Structures are given as C-alpha cells and as structure tokens.
From a paper:
The H2A–H2B and H3–H4 heterodimers are formed by interactions between the histone-fold domains, and the histone octamer is established with two each of the H2A–H2B and H3–H4 dimers. The nucleosome core is composed of the histone octamer and approximately 150 bp of DNA, which is left-handedly wrapped around it in a symmetrical manner.
Consistent with the structure of the all tail-less nucleosome, the overall structure of the nucleosome containing acetylated H3 was quite similar to that of the non-acetylated nucleosome. Similarly, in both the H3K4/9/14Ac and H3K18/23/27Ac nucleosomes, the SHL(-5) pausing was clearly alleviated, and the amount of the run-off transcript was concomitantly increased. These results indicated that the acetylation of the H3 N-terminal tail enhances the RNAPII transcription on the nucleosome, probably by alleviating the RNAPII pausing at the SHL(–5) position. Therefore, the acetylation of the H3 N-terminal tail may reduce the nucleosomal DNA binding capability and directly up-regulate the nucleosome transcription elongation by RNAPII.
Numbering used by the authors:
A (entry chain C), B (entry chain G): 11 to 117
C (entry chain A), D (entry chain E): 39 to 133
E (entry chain H), F (entry chain D): 32 to 124
G (entry chain B), H (entry chain F): 25 to 102
The structure:
Amino acid sequence: RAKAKTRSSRAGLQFPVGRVHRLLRKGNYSERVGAGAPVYLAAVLEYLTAEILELAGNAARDNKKTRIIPRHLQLAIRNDEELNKLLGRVTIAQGGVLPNIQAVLLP
Amino acid sequence: RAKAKTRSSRAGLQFPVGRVHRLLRKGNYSERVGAGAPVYLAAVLEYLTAEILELAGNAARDNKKTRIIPRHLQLAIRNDEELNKLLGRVTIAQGGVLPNIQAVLLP
Amino acid sequence: HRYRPGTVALREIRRYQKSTELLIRKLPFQRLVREIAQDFKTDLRFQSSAVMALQEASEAYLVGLFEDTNLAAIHAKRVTIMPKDIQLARRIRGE
Amino acid sequence: HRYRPGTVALREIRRYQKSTELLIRKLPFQRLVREIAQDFKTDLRFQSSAVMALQEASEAYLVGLFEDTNLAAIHAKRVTIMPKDIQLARRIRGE
Amino acid sequence: SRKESYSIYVYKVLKQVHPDTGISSKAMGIMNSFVNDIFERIAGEASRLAHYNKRSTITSREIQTAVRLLLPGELAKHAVSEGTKAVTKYTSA
Amino acid sequence: SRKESYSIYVYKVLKQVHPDTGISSKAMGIMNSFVNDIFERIAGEASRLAHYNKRSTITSREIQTAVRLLLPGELAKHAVSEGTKAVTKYTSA
Amino acid sequence: NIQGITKPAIRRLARRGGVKRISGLIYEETRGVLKVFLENVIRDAVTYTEHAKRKTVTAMDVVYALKRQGRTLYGFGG
Amino acid sequence: NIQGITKPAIRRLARRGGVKRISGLIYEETRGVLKVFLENVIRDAVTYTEHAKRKTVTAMDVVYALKRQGRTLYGFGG
DNA sequence: ATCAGAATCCCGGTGCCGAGGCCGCTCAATTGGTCGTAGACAGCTCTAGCACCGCTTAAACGCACGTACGCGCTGTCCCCCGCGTTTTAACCGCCAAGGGGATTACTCCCTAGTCTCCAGGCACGTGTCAGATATATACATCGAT
DNA sequence: ATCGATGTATATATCTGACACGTGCCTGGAGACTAGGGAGTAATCCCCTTGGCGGTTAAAACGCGGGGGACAGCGCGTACGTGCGTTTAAGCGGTGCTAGAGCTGTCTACGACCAATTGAGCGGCCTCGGCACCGGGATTCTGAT
C-alpha cells in the first residue's frame, strides 16, 4: 500500500486530527461523527492555542524572560477583553492578578 | 405469554420507567444503561413533582383557589430555601415576585 | 387632597409585587425586537410565542437588576436609585 | 522616620499584586481542610496536589471577594472595607 | 404529529397529593419544563461520573451520586430514600 | 501506563510562533487544561445542536455553529476562517 | 424604537423591583442595559435559526439562547 | 484550626485585592466565608471519592468539584 | 524647593535542576474494502405570520407646585496603621513504615439486539363549572388639624 | 384624637371559555430468548501518604502612640413625586393572503466496521543553560522642614 499520510498533514495542521476524531467518537456526543468535524475542531483549537501562546511570549519578552510561565499566561488572557470573556469563570494557578489600584485611594 | 405488566406498576411509580429508559439510551449519555437507573430516576422525578405540587396546592388553598397557576408555583418555590436554591437560575413565566419591601423605605 | 411623597410609590410597589402581568407594551417591545434582529439577518419572521418569551425574560432580568440597584442605593445611605448604583450592581454581578 | 498611614498599605498592594506566591500558610490550611473534611467521612487521606488545588481555589475566591468588597466600600464613599461590604458583595453575587 | 409530554403523570401525582385541586395549562407547561430540566441535569451528571471512572454503564449508583451532588440537603435525603425503595420493589418484582 | 497529552502539539505551535521561546511545565499543564476545556465546550454545544435538530451526526456545520455561539467576536471570525480553510485543504487532498 | 420603552414602563418595573424613588438618568441607563441584553439573546436565537435553515425565530430558539446564557426560562416548551 | 488563618494572611489577601484600609471585624467575617466555601468544595470532592470507592481525595476530585460549582481551575490536570 | 533616609531596581557572579533532546518500543492511527441508512432534495399541503382598516379608551405626556432628600461642610473621637520587641511554630530535611491505589487475570451475569404483540397514551371532541368582570359596599389607612 | 377622603378588600350575580373526561387508534413498550463483553473479585506490588525529630529563622502576636477617617449633625436648593388636563397610539376584532414550516418519498453519498501494517507518540535517561539567589551600587520616592 501507499505510505501512511496523517490527516493532520493532509489538513496542514499540527494538532492531531485522528486523536480529536477518536475523542469525539468515544466522548458520548453523537451517534456518528462526520469526516470534517475533527479537522474543523483541530483547526479551531490550534488557532486559539497559537493566539494565547503568541500573547504570552510577547509578555515574556517584555519581562526579559525566555520561558512562558503561568504569570505570563494570566497577563495575556486578562489583557485581552475577548480572551478574558471566554475564560471568565476560569482560575489560572499561580497567575496572580493585574496591578490595579482604584484612583480614589491614591495619595 | 403473560399479561403485560409495566415497570412503573412493578416499582409502584406513576412516572414512566420505560419512557425514561428510552430517553436515557437515546440521549447520548452512556454506551449502556443499567436496569435500575430508569427506576431510580423516575422515582426521584416523581418525588420532586409531588413536593412542588403539594406546596402549590397549599398556596392555592390559601388564596381560596382550586386551580394551580404559575403564581402559585413561583410562591411555592421561592418560599422554600432549598427549592429556591435548586431553581435559583430559573425564571417561571407569569410567576411574578415575592412581596418584599425594605424596612428602611417604610414611613 | 394630596398624599405625601412616598405613599403612592409604596402603593404601586405593593400592587406590582402582587400582580403578574407584563408591564412593557407589546407593540413597542415587538418593534424593538425586530429592529435589533434586523442587524443580524434580514427578512426575519418571528413567532408570537418567541416575542412573548423575549418579553418575559427581559422583564424578569430588569426586575432582578432593579432589586440589586435598590440594595446598592440603601448601602450608600440613599433612597434614590442612580446610574452609579446600576453600574455597581452589574459590575459585581459579572456582566 | 514614620511613613504616613496609607503609604505602606499602598506599597503592600503593589507588592502582592506583582507577586504570585500563595499567601496562606500551608500547614494551617492543610489542618483546616482535614478538620472540615472529617465531618463528612472518617480516615480520609489527602493528596498533596489535592490540598494545593484547594488552597489555590480558596485564595482566588477570597481575592475576588475582597475586590468586590472594596468596590462596595468605595461606592459608599468609604475607603475601609467592612462586613456590610462583604455581605452586599455576596448578596449581589447570588451566594 | 405526536408530541410526548409528562402531562398525564404530573396530573396523576397532583390527584394523589391534592384530590380536589386541578391545574392550569400554563402551570402544566411549567411543570413539564421542570421535569425535563431535572432529567437533563441528573443524566448529565451521571454521564460525567461514568466517564470519570472509565465506566460505560450508567447505574443506580451513578444516579444516586448525581442526586446527592445536585439536590440540596433534605431534598437529596428524601429523593435517595424514594429511589432506593423503588429499586428494591422493582428488583423484588 | 501511558497517559496521552497535547504537550507535543502545543510545543510545535510555540516553536512556530516564537522560535526562541520555551515553556515551563506548569504553563504546559495550563495549556493542556485549556485545550481540554475548549474541546469539551465545543463538542458539547455541537452535540446539543444535533439533538435539537433531530440529527445523529456531528458535522462541520455543527462545529462551526458551536464556534460562532461560544467564541466572542473576532475570535469566532478567525476561528471560522481557519476551520474552513483546513476543511477545504483536507477535502482537496 | 428603543424609546417605546417609556418612562412609566421603567417605573413599573422598578416598582416591582421594590424601588421607591427614581433618578431621571435611570431611564436612559435602563434602556441601554435592556438593549444590550436583547442584542445578546437575539443574536444567539438567530444563530440557532440560521443553523436550522429556518426563516422564523422560534420559541425553542429563544429558550435555548436563554438557557445557554444561564437564564433558563420555564413555560415555553423547555 | 480556623484560627490558623491568621489576621496577617487575610490582610495579604486584601492587599492583593486592592484593599487599603481594613476594619477589625473583617477577619471574622472572612473566616466564616472561607469556611462555608471550603465546606461546599470538600463535600463535593468527598462525594466523588466515595463514588470511586477510594480513601484518598485526589486533585481530580477537587478539580471536578470546582468545575461543577462554576469555579474552573486550570493547572492541576484539568 | 530641599534633603536625608528608606525602599526598590538593576547589574554582575555562581550554581543547580529542570527543560529540551535522543532513543527504544508498542499500540493506535492509517489504508483498503464493504454495506446499510440517513439526510439531501423534490414536491405538496395548509398554518400562521404579516399587512391593513377602524374604533375605543386607557396609557403616555406635558406642566405646575411643593417638599423631602441628596449633598456639601464641620466637628469629634476612636480605632486602625505602622513600628519595635518577643515568641512560636512553619518549614526544610531526613528517615520509617504501611496501606491503599493501580494492575492483571479469570469468570459470569447483565445488558444490547431481535421479534412479536398489544395496550397505553395521545389528537380530537365536548360540555359544564371555576374564575373573570361588574357593581355595590365596607373598611382600614393616610393626612391635616 | 378625629373625621373626612379614599383606595382597597369583600360579597354576590352573570357569563364564558378552558379544562377535565371520553374515544379510537397506532406505535412504542413489554415478554421471551440469545450472545458476549464489561464489571466484579482476588492477589500483588510499589509508591506515596502519614508520622516523628530537630533546628532555626521568619513570621505572628502584642503594645503603643497618633492621625486620619468614619460618622453624626445641619443647612440649602433642587430635582422628583403627585395630580390634572390633553393627546397619542396601543389594543382588539375582522379579514387576506401568501411565505414557509412541516411532512412524505426516493435514493445516493457517506460513515461505521473490520483486518493488517507500521510509524507516531510516550516513558526513561542525560545534560547544559535559564533562572534564582546573593550582594552591592543607583535610582526613586516620601515627609519633615
């Protein structure tokens, strides 16, 4: 037969399409799973991951650091209104908070 | 064969065990459904229904009414701390609110 | 005869807290719904029950918000609700 | 030399808002967790990571509550947080 | 087109608890929504429990645990009692 | 016992967007939790949509609609673009 | 069309909410809040409608939108 | 054991929350609130543990309890 | 404005331990083929949503006026902050034990699947009685004196 | 107190439409039998949780002085509540028609399933470089003068 070509490579993705497919089929979501659903889902996940990682890397570079930490992830998420809305009810371990002091309290 | 005896009658319940079973199997919850699960679920649902209906009938009688209305249901739910907690984020159509005036506003 | 300020307000509180009918006019609410929906998709039709559900939900939401606003006002040693009270309530609520 | 009231408080705000370490002592928190859990089931063991997760969640919750409490206090034209402020925040939040 | 509902059973329970009390159509619709909601909650919690424990079957244990997790206090206590009694009676035919 | 995770793929994406930037184990754990959470949300919404429309198959339309419902604003816009591009490329081999 | 939510209506809602005295800027604030809420719900309902390939927003669509925004409504089929 | 949550700790938490001045009754109020929160989470975690027939509360149990109470925690395996 | 002192920031050096990479293996994804079925599309029905006209009347609106309340200012006193000193117990490291959590293997019983049948539940129809409305009235409450 | 206005509850009579019961049917649930695989149970192993010891040091507790912030009182002026006359459009009832929801029939593309292959992904081991800790000078910032 022909050499095995991964569906991720066929779709130009880094995320595992086959794994996403298995998780959908065995996750008690529906009776059947279309062929395009894992591809679409993987692409969406990849996009979101790329966005967060890029913003966290920028925060790290601004902090003269070369490794991303929970602090950097928290900064990236909380400084973007849309990401904050998406992850509103989520607590990032070891993330801390944004420096914010009410103006009325300042000397 | 033997005369058909409903599982509801075998369990001494009014809620439909067979229907609950079908809804569980076709609701994408699990691969398999135990024989006791529909019975248990039906009994719990029946108990909750009985509780609400009794409290609503009591409210109706207190309002000199013989028919339960959404108002009576709302009164019954909101006047019981536990039921209110269970149905905290639920809006009953045509239910109104509980009579409550802050003490500081009184003459 | 003139009732002192507050008496009629309290009478209205009691009446509306005892009643359950919808308090927003149907036709204006429907027009608002349609105007808002126009921005998402054109030539949209609406079920009567759909409009009724929207009205019920909106009224319930607004009543709850006014309750929290009142609590904020009382907290600030006031008896008058203000935009700052609505804003505080909404912020704390997570909106 | 004595810093005027407020200076050290603001310095502490800046420091703790810049840092990310846990602020509750580990051993006391663990004892509290075990004491509370004892009333539900006896001879209960606890994973270190379980206790750590509990601590993180509790601290985050309390920080959020203090934020809302501060907002309530400021709303009442005060700079000091009080039990009435905590109560208001919690009531509005639905807790 | 037949549309299934819980009307018959809700009415039966009403006539058991309040023989001389009826119910409006609006209240019946509310009750139907309630039953559906609670069903969904319980089934979803049982499903999650099963998945967490790498099990493929939803049993009375999963239902019981879901009930304990969702229903507060004495609601849970009595619901559990009712479920256990029903299961026992069914298992003894 | 082998325990699957998204570490490898997250690392690939990181190396694409920031070739000289690494990641700590804690942050990696965060990323894994994030991916799992979003996956769950999207799949669950798609499942609900399918059930509402009396369909037995979760397709790219269901995924797209779930994305539109969950992701706010431009997050949704770009995610939809990405998904469509990926599906097209895959379908054209 | 937002002005159709008249001042008396807002007052009635406040009365049901137990409000005794109302500032003049409350009406505009309330109108804005209601508009935002409505926009969100209608958006989701229309999304459901388009997914169903329908031209009529249904009560089911509205109910689902409310449910997914954590504002479950009883009385309209779920 | 509730006294182990000392006043300095509560002060630090308030400082992270942006609080500048603190009343003396805040410590007791906070202790009570924390106790309630902990009770709820631990209750749910123990329920999960008992369902699994385990004697050790796991991080997964805690995570699940937090998730179902709408306080999703990232960083501890889900 | 000034100045001294306290705190934080930054810069450089040393070490250490955790992230990154490499390698063996194994099991989970891929490929190729088959088969049933589900949902895509065409077409027909008929429901209900939209548009309009007319009349009525109840709600909205504009305005006058009075007064209660928001808000700013002032004084007082108390209680929280900030800092110095003593105590205590948290933390780190190190060791010991045992218990329970995870794994594997065997079995058996419990549930899906199929068929056949039949009764319960659900549209349709109907009639009659509970509640809505109208009217009169009694009664309690608000207000000015 | 108190009486007068006034809104609100209460008591009775007519109607009406909406709910409670009956009927016919049909389709979903029940009885019966089968296979097979998922879960229960029993033994094992090892890891990871619990318990104890000691020191030591950082953090908590306590005392005290004072200053600034909470809070109570007062005056004023203005914005909002109440009432009344006008006008505006909401509501209701009838009628129209057509778009589109909903159902049925047909068929073809598409996804489940299954067996063989193999290569992607995971566990384990090792090392080196990013970061952390220490220490010391620079800069900032605060408060008293």
